[PDB]
Design a protein around this ligand. Structure first.
Ligand code: UPG
Ligand code: MN
Ligand code: MN
Length: 352
């Protein structure tokens, strides 16, 4: 069967990470061949850049058109920039097909999307003096890049509006963890640990996958292929049920980008606020088949998700020490990946 997957993308700087490339990665995720309620996309923005927030907003709106198109016509790859680069053979058709008509309209929609993103980048090139202001009229909470509250915004999903055929889309979650002078943030490693916790509060999928912001999914069946291995030339795979044992794999395994791996392996254990002072998160670590308690409102969940990204959350905890992505510059050569402990079940499937 098909287990839920939480997909993590970390970004920091739209000037080094062009918004359109990130958008293409996100669109290839949102259009993946998978039940929409069982794939979720979390984008961490450590730059707290309004440009990234707004380009992700525009991206979700375009996804509402792009996703049903790809699924109707079995498009590959589902990153529009790369799909539209491939040449099509119009001469083999006597008359314009429904596919060709739909594709010509989709391509101009994509060109228009691109122009809007270019406009966002241009406007970002030069500050106004009072900092940025949002749709509302209210100021952008991340104007001070090193001194700003935690921000979470859920797009699409169950309550985020339908695609062009009237169907729900996967959740897309913007996350910018809190930053305050006097608190270390540990860069990507700290972002990934924050995303482990945010995802656990909001979806808590048994499997996690971390993609670079330019690593678009090339084959929409990638998650199904992974599940063919994870549930009872070639790519990297690992399976282990560890007990006791001078036998078998000894010690932890570390996993980086592009691999689906099982979440509970992160929680590998030696109280329980080695995990930090979140009742909701600690409870989530105890559900062996994932999910969230049915009686939590998106509103209370958004509480809890904000709490788990506060800048002091990891103080007095094992995060970055023995749990999650591990902090370094001492002995441990990680923060090249998540630490999967021996204790129980471990499984990894990496994409080609
Ligand atoms: O605060 C941050 C910084 C980076 N990243 C992510 O981590 C990855 C690394 O990108 P990079 O531009 O290399 O970030 P750096 O913090 O600068 O990490 C580098 O810092 C040195 C100087 O840039 C480099 O020589 C090293 O390759 C590397 O450790 C990207 O996916 C980034 O989105 C975050 O999530 N949060
Ligand atoms: Mn810390
Ligand atoms: Mn990355």
């Amino acid at each position: 069967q098909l287990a839920a997957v939480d997909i993590f993308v970390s970004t920091v700087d739209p000037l080094k990470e062009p918004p359109l490339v990130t958008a293409n990665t996100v669109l290839s995720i949102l259009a993946v061949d998978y039940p929409v309620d069982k794939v979720s996309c979390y984008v961490s923005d450590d730059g707290a850049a309004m440009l990234s927030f707004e380009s992700l907003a525009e991206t979700s709106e375009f996804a509402r058109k792009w996703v049903p198109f790809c699924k109707k016509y079995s498009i590959e790859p589902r990153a529009p920039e790369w799909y539209f680069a491939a040449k099509i053979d119009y001469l083999k058709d006597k008359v314009q097909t429904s596919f060709v008509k739909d594709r010509r309209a989709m391509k101009r929609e994509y060109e228009e999307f691109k122009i809007r993103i270019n406009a966002l980048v241009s406007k970002a090139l030069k500050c106004p003096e009072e900092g940025w202001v949002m749709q509302d009229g209210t100021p952008w909470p991340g104007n001070n890049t090193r001194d700003h509250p935690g921000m979470i915004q859920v797009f699409l999903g169950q309550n985020g509006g339908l695609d062009a055929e009237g169907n729900e889309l996967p959740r897309l979650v913007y996350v910018s963890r809190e930053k305050r002078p006097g608190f270390q943030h540990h860069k990507k490693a700290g972002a990934m640990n924050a995303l482990v916790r945010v995802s656990a509060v909001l979806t808590n999928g048994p499997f996690i996958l971390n993609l670079d912001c330019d690593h678009y999914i090339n084959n929409s069946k990638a998650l199904r292929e992974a599940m063919c291995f994870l549930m009872d030339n070639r790519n990297t795979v690992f399976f282990d049920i560890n007990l006791r044992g001078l036998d078998g794999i000894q010690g932890p395994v570390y996993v980086g980008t592009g691999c689906v791996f099982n979440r509970t392996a992160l929680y590998g254990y030696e109280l329980e606020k080695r995990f930090g002072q979140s009742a909701v998160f600690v409870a989530s670590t105890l559900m062996e088949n994932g999910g969230v308690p049915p009686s939590a409102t998106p509103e209370n969940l958004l509480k809890e998700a904000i709490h788990v990204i506060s800048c002091g959350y990891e103080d007095k905890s094992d995060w970055g020490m023995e749990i999650g992505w591990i902090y370094g510059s001492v002995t441990e050569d990680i923060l090249t990946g998540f630490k999967m402990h021996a204790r129980g079940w471990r499984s990894i499937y990496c994409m080609p």
